[PDB]
Design a protein around this nucleic acid. Structure first.
Lengths: 62, 59, 63, 60, 59, 62
DNA sequence: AATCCAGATTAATCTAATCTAATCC
DNA sequence: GGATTAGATTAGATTAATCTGGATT
DNA sequence: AATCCAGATTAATCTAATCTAATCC
DNA sequence: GGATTAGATTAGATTAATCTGGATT
């Protein structure tokens, strides 16, 4: 049960899935449907998505 | 290609930073350090600084 | 560039706060509400709390 | 009781690693994986890197 | 092999060393010994001494 | 004002010939300028262009 | 329509991992 | 100079608070 | 007294870092 | 408006011409 490590690869896959849906609409369940990465949980993604949204809000939009 | 969008909040931080250094004397590295915005680059600040100087010269 | 100094008095107020909450349930925000010390941030307390927990964990006085 | 001695060799290895990441953004964990030296811990590298930053920052 | 950057602090030490020596006794090697800055080279201060002399000439 | 210099095909060609004639040891700004003999062109025009030229070749050479 | 509510998401906050400054030897 | 300790930072986890779609009234 | 010569000094000139303007989306 | 490329500016580095103190002739 170890901590997720958001590598550039995994983050890339997350980014791709979020763009498919729209950063405004993306939710953890539908991000994971697309990512197809087993062992990755909804909370895992939710926490990353919030961190992602904070980052994009400063640089624009979102 | 994630463009920066200069929202009211981020432009305002830029205005405070540039005004602390002086409009004509402000350089991107110093503006970037004062703003302390993760992900923001020299080229972001420099491109926005150029349009800001045009806009200020028309006044 | 200011760094917090956990003086003996400050650390004792922190311990008084943590014992009032229970070291199990204690979290930085509630600790700061009790301590009533301006200038301390939640990050200052969370760093100190983690060192305190590391120490207590070896001696077994915490989960 | 064994202290690490930063021989010229080893320091050069460390400088090479640090230059490969960037002095400002280098951290002990990345330095160690580049250096690939068994025997060296994070703390050995972090102590050396503190002293190294002191020296370089006085010079800019 | 790092370029030197002349900070406010390092430059302050330079001016005090120049002023103490008197321009000129203020030459690089002796300015360097006064500053006693690890890694600062004779050439670092010789180059800075040159631009400073130009700077003083313009008042 | 002074006009910004624009490195046209013809002006760049003359700089390239000068560089190649001198070699890299002697291809410093003042000598490139003497060979090019174009009125109003300055050291800093050449030095600026020389720095971009050297980056451009290091890329080519790898 | 209007309400209930379990589940989902999201903001707020926590905390482990790791870093870096301060201090020690 | 190098080790150790104390406090700061970052990324990811957990908790608390909202939200909403679907069932019910 | 005068010359030699390493080890400097110093002006001239170069060059990397960083900048701003021009131009492209 | 924001990104990218080309040419400009600046600070620091390097080179080249000159100078000098201590030894020597």
């Amino acid at each position: 049960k170890p901590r997720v490590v958001w590598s550039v690869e995994l983050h890339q896959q997350f980014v791709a899935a979020v763009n498919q849906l729209g950063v405004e609409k993306a939710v953890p369940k539908k991000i994971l449907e697309l990512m197809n990465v087993p062992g990755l949980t909804r909370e895992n993604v939710a926490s990353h998505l919030q961190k992602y949204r904070i980052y994009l809000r400063r640089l624009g939009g979102v």
